[PDB]
RNA sequence: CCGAUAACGAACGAGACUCUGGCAUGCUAACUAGUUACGCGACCCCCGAGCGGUCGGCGUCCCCCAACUUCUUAGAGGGACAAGUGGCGUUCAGCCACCCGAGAUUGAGCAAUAACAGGUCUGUGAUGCCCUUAGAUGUCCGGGGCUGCACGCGCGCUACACUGACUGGCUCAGCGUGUGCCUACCCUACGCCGGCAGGCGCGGGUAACCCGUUGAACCCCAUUCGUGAUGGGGAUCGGGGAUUGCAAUUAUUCCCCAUGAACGAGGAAUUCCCAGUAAGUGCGGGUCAUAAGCUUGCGUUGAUUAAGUCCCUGCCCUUUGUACACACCGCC
């Protein structure tokens, strides 16, 4: 009914994990027509736990310098790189996004301050928000090295490095460093 | 801020003058402190007497 | 956080209180609207912020007796303590358990044999003191 | 032979941990036994009531 | 602040205060701001609409020849107080969450005692002392210099590109300034010439009246480019044309045509920042005969992360040690 852009339903995406579904906010209480809302969610702490993760990724997918305001340039190039999942795979763009989230997500990560073992002291499991947090960052990370000095564009980049993190394959740079980040935290134990 | 030009240099005087409240104004400020808060005296108006009706 | 009261808000709302009980209410606004012909407030703020503090003070004085003097609060003490003498006195007791020791010095001061003292049966063992140091 | 990932839920915030706070510690339960609840330290922003993970089931407990 | 209490009663600072931003279809007011309605018009549909649609076209404070303040302006007022609910709390001071609300922490200004051999005598007809005072260290005039370059450092601007460059089209601001006591030097509409920088006539504005509905940039929409030191970058350098001035060389600035150098994200180190914020992006003021890579403001687009800690760098309070008191950059 709110179909986003246009199309791609949202009440047919289900997450298969329900560490993150208080955190993803595809359901139809947050499915909006456009990932463009001044709604103020960094204003309380856990704000963003409700913002839509399309939102999300459009606000974590401008940076770098020339790109700080850019935010219509961002959304046109989500909704070409969803027009491009969905030729590539068949389902749905959102679903892939989810997945994407949900394979990127890092179980567990490690800190601490004194005399490092490997990297940390510590190995600590992390919060399902810093999972959704740093999901969105490596997969917006790995999509602009992807498309930084090559013909192919950012949206084909975006398109499958959320492609390659959805299955998971080794392929995309999102897991590769939640399988770094998971390695390290398995040595610091 | 004044200069007194003494015969070793310049000596600064300042004077600072803290003006008495006046609602009259012609020696201070008319408006009262910020923080300065004065009540009025309330009276008694005890009544404690029975319940009359006067005519007038 | 940061909104704690001061003693120019905290000192005018007692006195207010203590002056006006009658006129004050539970309502911020009546309150608010009471401040400017019982007190002259320099400052909106300011006088809203006393008649906030006038509302948590009587909300506290009608749940206790804070202690902003108040005529109705002192007279119920005053009723509360200089009355409430029981008609049969606390100190009129038909029997008093007394010591055998205490018999001696009553006998020594004369006083003894009385009807109304019952001679106690004194206890044995001497078992007073705490246990010294600590176990 | 390796052990399998388990969830648990948060059920209280101990407080923050760490020395630069990066690290807030909670008393979490666990999904397969509800009686049985345990003390970790987690990174990122917690609030009670939220499931994890937990790829190693006991690490350590230490009352702040 | 509540509380204890050999203290009682005070004073400054903080707060309070002023400005600022957010709500007021509540009040007052508007031909130097408008809106609605109506009337002339201009164009499309005319199949037939017709109280159809567009007009920043003309009018209705031209005085009888419409009303009104929503929008704009600026005054008086209101409004928010931890006020209401739940929990925590010695059930106090208060804290957390929530409802209703424009707002439940908007940014600044002011800012104590005591100090520093901190900076300015190159701001002053503020100034002690010293120096000079007719071959002047006064003052004026001409020229040069303050730019000068094996090198090191600081604040910045431009970039390293395709989340882009070019070409065209579409489309949106707010601060704020504007003709001078000396003092000459203002902001500019429109028309014409020139390819551009500019030039030539006609005006308007001492200003909510004119520039100006400030048609800003970024952004948006299409084109070409195609991973190359390439249509990225525009330093260096040659020739030519204007503008300011009394004067442009050591190029004032601007314009045009050529040259495309390093630069492919930057070691060790290090700065700033919590919401309309950082950052991208332009526009005003100051400097200004000529002019901004500076600075002070303004608007446009608008996030990632965090609601914690004393780990590093520091600050406050209490206890404690001291061989320090120029006070650990001490002393020895
Ligand atoms: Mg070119």
């Given at each position: 009914?709110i ?7 949202t ?5 298969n994990?329900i560490?993150?579904?208080?955190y ?23 704000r ?8 999300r ?12 305001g850019k935010?219509?340039?961002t959304?046109?190039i989500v909704?070409?790189?969803?027009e ?15 997945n994407?989230?949900?394979?990127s997500?890092?179980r ?7 005399r490092?073992?490997?990297?940390r002291?510590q190995?600590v499991d992390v ?5 959704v947090?740093?999901a969105?960052?490596?997969?917006c ?17 975006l ?12 392929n ?8 770094e980040?998971?390695?390290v ?5 | 801020?004044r ?12 004077v ?10 012609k020696?201070?400020?008319k408006?009262?402190?910020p923080?300065?808060?004065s009540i009025?005296?309330?009276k008694?108006?005890?009544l ?8 007038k | 956080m ?13 006195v207010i ?16 609207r009471?401040c400017?012909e019982?007190?002259i ?5 300011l006088?809203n912020?006393?008649?906030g ?6 909300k ?7 202690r ?14 200089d ?7 606390a100190?009129?007791?038909?029997i008093?358990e007394?010591?055998p020791?205490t ?11 009385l ?13 007073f ?6 176990v | ?5 388990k969830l ?7 407080g923050?941990?760490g020395?630069?706070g990066?690290?807030?510690q ?11 609840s345990?003390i ?7 609030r009670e009531?939220d499931?994890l ?8 407990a230490?009352?702040?």
């Amino acid at each position: 009914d709110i179909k986003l852009f246009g199309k791609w339903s949202t009440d047919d995406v289900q997450i298969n994990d329900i560490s993150l579904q208080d955190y993803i906010a595809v359901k139809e209480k947050y499915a909006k027509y456009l990932p463009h809302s001044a709604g103020r969610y960094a204003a309380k702490r856990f704000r963003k736990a409700q913002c839509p993760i399309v939102e999300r990724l459009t606000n974590s997918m401008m940076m770098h310098g020339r790109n700080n305001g850019k935010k219509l340039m961002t959304v046109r190039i989500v909704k070409h790189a969803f027009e491009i999942i969905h030729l590539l795979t068949g389902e749905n763009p959102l679903q892939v996004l989810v997945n994407a989230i949900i394979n990127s997500g890092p179980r567990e990560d490690s800190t601490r301050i004194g005399r490092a073992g490997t990297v940390r002291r510590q190995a600590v499991d992390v919060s399902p928000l810093r999972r959704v947090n740093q999901a969105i960052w490596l997969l917006c990370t790995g999509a602009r090295e992807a498309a930084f000095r090559n013909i192919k564009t950012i949206a084909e980049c975006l398109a499958d490095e959320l492609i390659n993190a959805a299955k998971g394959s080794s392929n995309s740079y999102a897991i590769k460093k939640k399988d770094e980040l998971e390695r390290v935290a398995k040595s610091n134990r | 801020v004044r200069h007194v030009l003494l015969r070793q240099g310049v000596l600064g005087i300042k004077v600072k003058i803290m003006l008495p409240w006046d609602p009259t104004g012609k020696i201070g400020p008319k408006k009262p402190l910020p923080d300065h808060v004065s009540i009025v005296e309330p009276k008694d108006e005890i009544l404690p007497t029975t319940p009359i009706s006067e005519q007038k | 956080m940061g909104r704690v009261r001061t003693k120019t808000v905290k000192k005018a709302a007692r006195v207010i209180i203590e002056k006006y009980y009658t006129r004050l209410g539970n309502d911020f606004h009546t309150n608010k609207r009471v401040c400017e012909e019982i007190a002259i407030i320099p400052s909106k703020k300011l006088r809203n912020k006393i008649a906030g503090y006038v509302t948590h003070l009587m909300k506290r004085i009608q749940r206790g007796p804070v202690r902003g003097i108040s005529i109705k609060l002192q007279e119920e003490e005053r009723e509360r303590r200089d009355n409430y003498v029981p008609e049969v006195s606390a100190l009129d007791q038909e029997i008093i358990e007394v010591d055998p020791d205490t018999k001696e010095m009553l006998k020594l001061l004369d006083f003894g044999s009385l009807s109304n003292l019952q001679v106690t049966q004194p206890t044995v063992g001497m078992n007073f003191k705490t246990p010294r140091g600590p176990v | 032979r390796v052990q399998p990932i388990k969830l648990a839920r948060v059920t209280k915030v101990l407080g923050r941990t760490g020395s630069q706070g990066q690290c807030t510690q909670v008393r979490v339960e666990f999904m397969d036994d509800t009686s049985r609840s345990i003390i970790r330290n987690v990174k990122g922003p917690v609030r009670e009531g939220d499931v994890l993970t937990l790829l190693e089931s006991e690490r350590e407990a230490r009352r702040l």
